């Protein structure tokens, strides 16, 4: 169970995860289901090296990621339930005064903006666990 770097076709490995860079115009919840129906989830990001890997492959015109303010009251959490131990917010984000802007996108710089969930974006990123080579 020693080496975890195998992904399915069309996915890209980085560390112990596989990532799928989707293209196609979708609102946040729609991208959420595209990822689930391929057996991953909208991406969660947990380190600067993971962020750097995403920034190099990310779409220039913005991508949905798996961060959402779930519950009115300003606390953004990952769809996969993993915890928030890393953040790459654009300066000033997320703001208190933006009622309704509960979903998160990653810009071409890789920095994160909150967004209305019904915004349509051209790209979205899924992740899943890499499987491991038997030695």
Author numbering: 157 to 291
From the paper:
The Ca2+-free and Ca2+-soaked derCD23 crystals both belong to space group P1 and have four molecules within the asymmetric unit. Although the four copies of loop 4 in the Ca2+-bound structure adopt similar conformations, two copies of this loop in the Ca2+-free structure adopt a different conformation, and the other two adopt yet another. In Ca2+-free “conformation 1,” two principal binding site residues (Glu-249 and Asp-270) are in a similar position to that observed in the Ca2+-bound structure, although the orientation of the Thr-251 side chain is different. The trans configuration of Pro-250 forms two hydrogen bonds with Arg-253, whereas cis Pro-250 cannot; consequently, both Arg-253 and Ser-254 are disordered when Pro-250 is cis (conformation 1), but are ordered, with Arg-253 pointing into a cavity between loops 1 and 4, when Pro-250 is trans (conformation 2). Thus, trans is apparently favored in the absence of Ca2+ or other factors.
The second principal receptor for IgE, CD23, is a type II transmembrane glycoprotein with a C-type lectin-like domain (CTLD)4 (3, 4). In its membrane-bound form, CD23 consists of three CTLD “heads” connected to the membrane via a trimeric α-helical coiled-coil “stalk”. The interaction between CD23 and IgE is critical in the regulation of IgE synthesis, which can be up- or down-regulated depending on the oligomerization state of CD23 (2, 9, 10). We have determined the crystal structures of the human lectin-like head domain of CD23 in its Ca2+-free and Ca2+-bound forms, as well as the crystal structure of the Ca2+-bound head domain of CD23 in complex with a subfragment of IgE-Fc consisting of the dimer of Cϵ3 and Cϵ4 domains (Fcϵ3-4).
